[PDB]
Design a protein around this ligand. Structure first.
Ligand SMILES: *[C@@H]1O[C@H](CO)[C@@H](O[C@@H]2O[C@H](CO)[C@@H](O)[C@H](O)[C@H]2NC(C)=O)[C@H](O)[C@H]1NC(C)=O
Ligand SMILES: *[C@@H]1O[C@H](CO)[C@@H](O[C@@H]2O[C@H](CO)[C@@H](O)[C@H](O)[C@H]2NC(C)=O)[C@H](O)[C@H]1NC(C)=O
Ligand SMILES: *[C@@H]1O[C@H](CO)[C@@H](O[C@@H]2O[C@H](CO)[C@@H](O)[C@H](O)[C@H]2NC(C)=O)[C@H](O)[C@H]1NC(C)=O
Ligand SMILES: *[C@@H]1O[C@H](CO)[C@@H](O[C@@H]2O[C@H](CO)[C@@H](O)[C@H](O)[C@H]2NC(C)=O)[C@H](O)[C@H]1NC(C)=O
Ligand SMILES: *[C@@H]1O[C@H](CO)[C@@H](O)[C@H](O)[C@H]1NC(C)=O
Lengths: 71, 314, 228
C-alpha cells in the first residue's frame, strides 16, 4: 500500500493499472479516487480516429438546438 | 505566449527560525501569518493548473493522424509528432525545449505541475490532427473529414478569393508553404532573443527565490546574524528583544515576497486568458479580426508546446 | 419550425432542471463571498494576537505598567495591527482588480453575444452561435446561449470541379457530392442535394489544370425553353 511518485511518497492507497478521469489531483499526472482509495494516472480523453481520404467528405443531415449556461 | 509559472511553496518555521526549537516557541506568539501564506500559495498553485487546463484541455477527443501523411503536396513533417524519438515530440518542439533551460531546501520547495509534458504534447498532437483532417468542424461538433485542398479552398473563399485561384495554383502554394516552414525552423534555431519571454519568466522566479534565500544572512541591526549564537550568548530577557527584531525583519521580507508572487501570478493569469482566447479563435476556426492571428489576411494556425508556454504558427 | 420550437422548449426545461439539481454550478459566484468572508474573519482574528508583547489587551498594558515600557508595548501593538490592515488592503486591491477584469469581460460578452450575433468561435457558447439571453444573479450575471449543433452526418464522394465541353465548372456557394452514380451540389452545413445547373456554378478556364476533376454533364435551364 506504499507508492512512490514524482511528487513524493504515498501511503494508504494502492496503484491501479486502469485509467479514469482525474478526481483528486495529486501531481505529475497522478490522481486519487475513492471507490478503498486508489491512485492512478489520469486519462486524457476518449480516443477517436477519423476516416480521412483523398476524395471523401462527410455532410450533416440533422441539427440540434442546444442551450448552455455561463456564469 | 507564457501560460503558467512555477508552483512554489514555503515552510514557515524552517525559514523564519533555524534548527533550534525554542525559537519556534517565541514564534508562536507573533500571530497566524503561516495560515495566510499557505492559503495564498495554495491558491496560486491551483491557479497555475487551472490556467494550463483552460489553455490546452479544450477537446474531449484524442484524434490521430492517418498513417499515410500525404495531403496533396503539403508537408507537415515538421510539426507532426516524431515516433522515432522516445518523447514523441515534433522537431520544432524539441528545438523549443533545447533552447530553454541550486538545490538549497531551506524551507523552500517546488511543487511539480499536475500535467506532465507528455500530456501537453498529446493535446497538441490531437489538436493538430483535428485541424488537419477535419478543418474547423471538429471545434463546433462532431469531426467531419474534408480533403485538405478543399479546406484551403474554403479558407480562400473566406478571405474573399475565389476557389479557382487555389485550384489552378496548388503546387506553387504547397511549395511556398513548405519553404516558409523551413525558414521558420531556421529562424527559430538561429535567433537567441526569439524565446525571450519564457526565459524571462524563469529568470524572474529564480532571481526572486535567490534574493529571498540571500536576505536571510542580514543582521537587521542585531549584534549577530546567527540566532543560536545569540541564544548561547545573552540572558534570555534581552535575547528576546534581539530575536524579536530578527523575526520581524524576516517576516517583513517574506511578506514582500508573497506580495510580489501574487502580482506576478495575476499577470500570468491574464496572459493565459489571452492565450486561451487565441487558441479558441485562431486555431479551431478562422478569424476576421485584423492582426489578431498574424500579420496579413489570416488563413490558419498551429499550436506547439514550450516550457511554461505555447507557440502559435500563423 | 415546429421541430426547432420543440427542441428549444426541451432544452430550456433541461437547463432549468440542471440548475435546480447541480450544486456546484454556481461555484464562481460563491467563491467571491467565501473569500471575502474568510479574509474579513482573518482580519478580525488578527486583533487578538500579542504581536510579541506580554499581553494582547491594550488597557491591561496601560493599567499594569508605568509609561516607560508601556509605550514600547503599545508601539509594538500598533505597528503589528497597522501592518495587518495594510496587508488586508493590498489583498482587497488585488481582488478588486481581478473582479474589474471579469466585469469588463462580462460587459463585452453582453454587448456582443446578446445585442447581436457574433462569429467568434467559442466566445458565446460551444457550436454555431444563434442568440443569448441574460439573467441576474447575486453579484453576477448568467448567460443562456442558444446555439446550433450539426448531427447525423453521412459520407459522400466529392470532386473539386466538373469538366464539361472543355470548360471547368466550380460551385458558387455549395460543394459537389455524389451518392455513387449521380452528382449534385449541396450547401456546406446541411444536406440538400440539387441538380447541377449553370446558375449555381461558374466557369473558369479549361479542365486540364485542376487535379481530381471528374466528367459529368451540366443541365441548362434555358435549353428546354429555347427548344419549344
Ligand atoms: C432530425 O432529428 C430530430 C431529432 O433530433 C428528428 O425528430 C425526431 O424524429 C423521430 C422519428 O420521426 C421522432 O420519434 C421524434 O419524436 C422526433 N423528435 C422530436 C423532438 O420531435 C427528425 O426526424 C430528424 N430529421 C430527419 C430528416 O431524420
Ligand atoms: C517533407 O519535409 C521533410 C523535411 O522538412 C523531408 O524530409 C527530408 O527528406 C530528405 C530526403 O528523404 C532528407 O535528405 C532530409 O534529411 C529530410 N529532412 C529532415 C528534416 O529529416 C520530407 O522528404 C518531405 N516530404 C515528405 C513526404 O515527408
Ligand atoms: C443517387 O441519387 C439519384 C438521384 O435521386 C438516384 O436516382 C434516382 O433515384 C430515385 C430514388 O430511388 C429513383 O426514383 C429515380 O428513378 C432515380 N433516377 C435515375 C435516373 O436512376 C440514384 O438511385 C441514387 N443512387 C444511389 C446508389 O442511391
Ligand atoms: C473525360 O472526357 C474527356 C473527353 O471525353 C476525356 O478526354 C479524352 O480521353 C481519352 C482517353 O485518355 C483520350 O484518348 C482523348 O484524347 C481525350 N480527349 C480530350 C479532348 O482530352 C477524359 O479522359 C475523360 N476523363 C475521365 C476521367 O474519364
Ligand atoms: C488518394 O489517396 C492516397 C492515399 O490515401 C494518395 O496517395 C493519392 O495521391 C490520392 N489520390 C490523388 C489523386 O491525390
Amino acid at each position: 500500500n506504499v507508492f512512490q511518485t514524482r511528487a513524493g511518497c504515498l501511503i494508504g492507497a494502492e496503484y491501479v493499472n486502469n485509467s479514469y478521469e482525474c478526481d483528486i489531483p495529486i501531481g505529475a499526472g497522478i490522481c486519487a479516487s475513492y471507490q478503498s482509495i486508489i491512485a492512478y494516472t489520469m486519462s486524457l480523453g476518449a480516443e477517436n480516429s477519423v476516416a480521412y481520404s483523398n476524395n471523401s467528405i462527410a455532410i450533416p443531415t440533422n441539427f440540434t438546438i442546444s442551450v448552455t449556461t455561463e456564469i | 505566449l507564457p501560460v503558467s509559472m512555477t508552483k512554489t511553496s514555503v515552510d514557515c518555521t524552517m525559514y523564519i527560525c533555524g534548527d533550534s526549537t525554542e525559537c519556534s516557541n517565541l514564534l508562536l506568539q507573533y500571530g497566524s501569518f503561516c495560515t495566510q501564506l499557505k492559503r495564498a500559495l495554495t491558491g496560486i498553485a491551483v491557479e497555475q493548473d487551472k490556467n494550463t487546463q483552460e489553455v490546452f484541455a479544450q477537446v474531449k477527443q484524442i484524434y490521430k493522424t492517418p498513417p499515410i501523411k500525404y495531403f496533396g503536396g503539403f508537408n507537415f513533417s515538421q510539426i507532426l509528432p516524431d515516433p522515432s524519438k522516445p518523447s514523441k515530440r515534433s522537431p520544432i518542439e524539441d528545438l523549443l525545449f533545447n533552447k530553454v533551460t541550486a538545490q538549497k531546501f531551506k524551507g523552500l520547495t517546488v511543487l511539480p505541475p499536475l500535467l506532465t509534458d507528455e500530456m501537453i504534447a498529446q493535446y497538441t498532437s490531437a489538436l493538430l490532427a483535428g485541424t488537419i483532417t477535419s478543418g474547423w468542424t471538429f471545434g463546433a461538433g462532431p469531426a467531419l473529414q474534408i480533403p485538405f485542398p478543399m479546406q484551403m479552398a474554403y479558407r480562400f473563399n473566406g478571405i474573399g478569393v475565389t476557389q479557382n485561384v487555389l485550384y489552378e495554383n496548388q503546387k506553387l502554394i504547397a511549395n511556398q508553404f513548405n519553404s516558409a516552414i523551413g525558414k521558420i525552423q531556421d529562424s527559430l534555431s538561429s535567433t537567441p532573443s526569439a524565446l525571450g519571454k519564457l526565459q524571462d519568466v524563469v529568470n524572474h522566479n529564480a532571481q526572486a527565490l535567490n534574493t529571498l534565500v540571500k536576505q536571510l544572512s542580514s543582521k537587521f541591526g542585531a549584534i549577530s546574524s546567527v540566532l543560536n549564537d545569540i541564544f548561547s550568548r545573552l540572558d534570555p530577557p534581552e535575547a528576546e528583544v534581539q530575536i524579536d527584531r530578527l523575526i520581524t525583519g524576516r517576516l517583513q521580507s517574506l511578506q514582500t515576497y508573497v506580495t510580489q508572487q501574487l502580482i506576478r501570478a495575476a499577470e500570468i493569469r491574464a496572459s493565459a486568458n489571452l492565450a486561451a482566447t487565441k487558441m479558441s479563435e485562431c486555431v479551431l476556426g478562422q478569424s476576421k479580426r485584423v492582426d489578431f492571428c498574424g500579420k496579413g489576411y489570416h488563413l490558419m494556425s498551429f499550436p506547439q508546446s514550450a516550457p511554461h508556454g505555447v507557440v502559435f504558427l500563423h | 419550425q415546429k421541430l426547432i420550437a420543440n427542441q428549444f422548449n426541451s432544452a430550456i426545461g433541461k437547463i432549468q432542471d440542471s440548475l435546480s439539481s447541480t450544486p456546484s454550478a454556481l461555484g464562481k459566484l460563491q467563491d467571491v463571498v467565501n473569500h471575502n468572508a474568510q479574509a474579513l474573519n482573518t482580519l478580525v482574528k488578527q486583533l487578538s494576537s500579542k504581536f510579541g508583547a506580554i499581553s494582547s489587551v491594550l488597557n491591561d498594558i496601560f493599567s499594569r505598567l508605568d509609561p516607560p515600557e508601556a509605550e514600547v508595548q503599545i508601539d509594538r501593538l500598533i505597528t503589528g495591527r497597522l501592518q495587518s490592515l495594510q496587508t488586508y488592503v493590498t489583498q482587497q486591491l488585488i481582488r478588486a482588480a481581478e473582479i474589474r477584469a471579469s466585469a469588463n469581460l462580462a460587459a463585452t460578452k453582453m454587448s456582443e453575444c446578446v445585442l447581436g450575433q457574433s462569429k467568434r468561435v467559442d466566445f458565446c457558447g460551444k457550436g454555431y452561435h444563434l442568440m443569448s439571453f441574460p439573467q441576474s444573479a447575486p453579484h453576477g450575471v448568467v448567460f443562456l446561449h442558444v446555439t446550433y449543433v450539426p448531427a447525423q452526418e453521412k459520407n459522400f464522394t466529392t470532386a473539386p470541379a466538373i469538366c464539361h465541353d472543355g470548360k471547368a465548372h466550380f460551385p458558387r456557394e455549395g460543394v459537389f457530392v455524389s451518392n455513387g452514380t449521380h452528382w449534385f451540389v449541396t450547401q456546406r452545413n446541411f444536406y440538400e442535394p440539387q441538380i447541377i445547373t449553370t446558375d449555381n456554378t461558374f466557369v473558369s478556364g479549361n479542365c486540364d489544370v485542376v487535379i481530381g476533376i471528374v466528367n459529368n454533364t451540366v443541365y441548362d435551364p434555358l435549353q428546354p425553353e429555347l427548344d419549344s
